[PDB]
């Protein structure tokens, strides 16, 4: 509250550390469905159904241009990528499996780096 603060957690390295994680996700072999924005002219249903499209290249551009105010807003956009994937893709498909694998990979790196 006013003039009552918990001790200052060091956040000076968060930007660098989120960038490293994002690099690791970009280079994973199962990243291919997520590297670029879904082409809304060429994929029927996507535009109407997925209210907030997100992909790794869009996260990279936001990160590089100071559009994440803190590490939680970064994790929210990564998780949105995988939540979108589950909304549009069956679990038993290559893309559906890719999303599960990438979410797992991310959540471990997130915990190991920050928690």
Curated annotation (Swiss-Prot):
- Family per record: Belongs to the WAL family.
Task of the protein: Regulatory subunit of the ATP-dependent BRF-1 and BRF-5 ISWI chromatin remodeling complexes, which form ordered nucleosome arrays on chromatin and facilitate access to DNA during DNA-templated processes such as DNA replication, transcription, and repair. Both complexes regulate the spacing of nucleosomes along the chromatin and have the ability to slide mononucleosomes to the center of a DNA template. The BRF-1 ISWI chromatin remodeling complex has a lower ATP hydrolysis rate than the BRF-5 ISWI chromatin remodeling complex.
Its recorded name reads Bromodomain adjacent to zinc finger domain protein 2B
Q: What range(s) does the Bromo domain occupy?
A: 9-113
Location(s) in or outside the cell: Nucleus
The record's account of tissue expression is:
Expressed at varying levels in several tissues, whereas a smaller transcript was expressed specifically in testis.
Which residue spans traverse the membrane?
none
Q: Which domain of life is it from?
A: Eukaryota
User: Subunit arrangement?
Assistant: Component of the BRF-1 ISWI chromatin remodeling complex, at least composed of SMARCA1 and BAZ2B, which regulates the spacing of histone octamers on the DNA template to facilitate access to DNA. Within the BRF-1 ISWI chromatin remodeling complex interacts with SMARCA1; the interaction is direct. Component of the BRF-5 ISWI chromatin remodeling complex, at least composed of SMARCA5/SNF2H and BAZ2B, which regulates the spacing of histone octamers on the DNA template to facilitate access to DNA.
């Amino acid at each position: 509250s006013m003039s009552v603060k918990k001790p200052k957690r060091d956040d000076s390295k968060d930007l660098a550390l989120c960038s490293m994680i994002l690099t690791e996700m970009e280079t994973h072999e199962d990243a291919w469905p997520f590297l670029l924005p879904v082409n809304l002219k060429l994929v029927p249903g996507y535009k109407k159904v997925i209210k907030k499209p997100m992909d790794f290249s869009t996260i990279r551009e936001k990160l590089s241009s100071g559009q994440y105010p803190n590490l939680e807003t970064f994790a929210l956009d990564v998780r949105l990528v995988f939540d979108n994937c589950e909304t549009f893709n069956e679990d038993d498909s290559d893309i559906g499996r890719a999303g599960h694998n990438m979410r797992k990979y991310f959540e471990k790196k997130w915990t190991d780096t920050f928690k």
